[PDB]
């Protein structure tokens, strides 16, 4: 079997700049005088899409700033000049041989200016007490880096968890990251306490508090 | 005009079955070979099988040999997995995919479907709870105002947010207890809300929910 190794696994390239992605080969993919490696890229939510196939044919359809080279077992992937656009996760695949294989990816990251979040606060809706739960919502949008540190505070006291955060990928446009983070206590526990604040630091900390 | 659609994807217990079809839209699978490939929770891809254009060849990946079977029928245009002795593992999104028609060789995977999301556990499908997040009745905004929807309580894990009225937000789901939990975000001008219509659309195919849930203050 043919063992593709990708390398790097991550790479943050400013806008302009020229990215370059490395894919090699356990063994040659070579046949026919030919190349039978492929590029494929991947943004979330969406499949795969082919960028290059037999190493340096750009597919019909895709952008200009894709190209690809190589043979035998080394073979690269340049974007130039990469655009906000690009954030993506992108693959290189083998069919020289049968059982075909995929690269293990290397996710494309915009390196940006440092922004602060936008921090949003909702207390459980009406809805969700009257059936009996309660879920406390923070949003803190559009900020760079995406090393942000959250943490909740009911009256006073830090709330370690029970708490779920997720971050969304990197917005195609302005090349930041936002995330979402859910305190989620009983009803009885919720109406037991008054204030909430949710914390946004990384320090002069950003804060969005309410009261019952 | 292109569009492969993919249908079939389920929740389904260890050791059961299902199949997967993959029918082409605008485009003719008829003289070109065609794969599966699936993508896992971890974010991977990993090649599952080919079949050639008139179906004499077929090749599978070590992962689903034995167990699974790819078939094509080209009159009606499209392509079928059969998977069979389904474990944790084969937990995925499956996507099929036509091959360029190439000579001198073999060829990339040119147009691919919109994946079907196959889930193998012994868990019971739940639909989701919607909960609206608006700000309060009374409260000073401006000069955008951020919305969003809680889905809670669902497996197993694919639910698709649509918003009706602007940037959104789609915050990847997580386990909670034996349940998942997502949310989603929009921003929208403080001028046009509440006076203008902002709704979410929540679909978890899996329990055949469909959700609207309009946003209003408070
Ligand atoms: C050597 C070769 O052609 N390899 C290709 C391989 O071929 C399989 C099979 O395909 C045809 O058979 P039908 O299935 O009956 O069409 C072919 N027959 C004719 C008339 O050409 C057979 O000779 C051949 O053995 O199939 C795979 C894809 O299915 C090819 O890969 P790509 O799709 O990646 O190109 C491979 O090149």
């Known amino acids: 079997d043919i063992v593709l190794t990708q390398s790097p696994a991550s790479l943050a390239v400013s806008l302009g700049q020229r990215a370059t992605i490395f894919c090699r080969a356990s063994?040659?993919?070579?046949?026919?005088?030919?190349?039978?490696m492929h590029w494929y890229q991947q943004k979330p939510g969406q499949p795969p899409k082919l960028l290059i196939y037999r190493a340096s044919n750009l597919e019909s359809g895709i952008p200009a700033r894709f190209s690809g080279s190589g043979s035998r077992t080394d073979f690269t992937l340049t974007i130039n000049p990469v655009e906000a656009d690009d954030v993506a996760t992108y693959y290189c695949?083998?069919?020289?041989?049968?059982?075909?294989?995929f690269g293990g990816g290397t996710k494309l990251e915009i390196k940006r200016a440092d922004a602060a979040p936008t921090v949003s606060i909702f207390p459980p809706s009406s809805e969700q007490l009257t059936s009996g739960g309660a879920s406390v919502v923070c949003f803190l949008n559009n900020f760079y880096p995406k090393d942000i540190n959250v943490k909740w505070k009911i009256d006073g006291s830090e709330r370690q968890n029970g708490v779920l955060n997720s971050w969304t990928d990197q917005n195609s446009k302005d090349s930041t990251y936002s995330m979402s983070s859910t305190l989620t206590l009983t009803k009885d526990e919720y109406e037991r306490h008054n204030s909430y604040t949710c914390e946004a630091t990384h320090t002069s900390p950003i804060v969005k508090s309410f009261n019952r | 005009e292109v569009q492969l659609v993919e249908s079939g994807g389920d929740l389904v217990k260890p050791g059961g079955s299902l199949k997967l079809s993959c029918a082409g839209s605008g485009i003719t699978f008829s003289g070109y070979g065609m794969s599966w490939v699936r993508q896992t929770p971890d974010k991977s891809l990993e090649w599952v099988a080919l079949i050639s254009n008139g179906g004499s060849y077929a090749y599978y990946s070590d992962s689903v040999k034995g167990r699974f079977t790819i078939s094509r029928d080209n009159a009606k245009n499209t392509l079928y997995l059969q998977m069979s002795s389904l474990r944790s593992d084969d937990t995925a999104i499956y996507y099929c995919?036509?091959?360029?028609?190439?000579?001198?060789?073999?060829?990339?995977?040119?147009?691919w479907g919109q994946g079907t999301s196959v889930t193998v556990s012994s868990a019971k499908t739940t639909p989701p709870s919607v909960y609206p997040l608006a700000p309060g009745c009374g409260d000073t905004t401006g000069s955008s105002v951020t919305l969003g929807c809680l889905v809670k309580g669902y497996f197993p894990e694919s639910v698709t947010v649509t918003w009706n009225s602007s940037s959104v937000h789609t915050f990847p789901a997580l386990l909670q207890s034996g349940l998942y939990t997502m949310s989603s975000s929009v921003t929208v001008p403080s001028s046009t809300w509440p006076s203008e219509t902002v709704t979410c659309s929540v679909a978890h195919p899996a329990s055949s929910t469909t959700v609207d849930k309009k946003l209003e203050p408070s």
């Open positions: 995919a036509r091959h360029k028609g190439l000579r001198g060789g073999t060829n990339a995977m040119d147009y």
């Open positions: 063994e040659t993919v070579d046949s026919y005088g030919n190349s039978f």
């Open positions: 695949q083998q069919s020289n041989e049968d059982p075909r294989t």
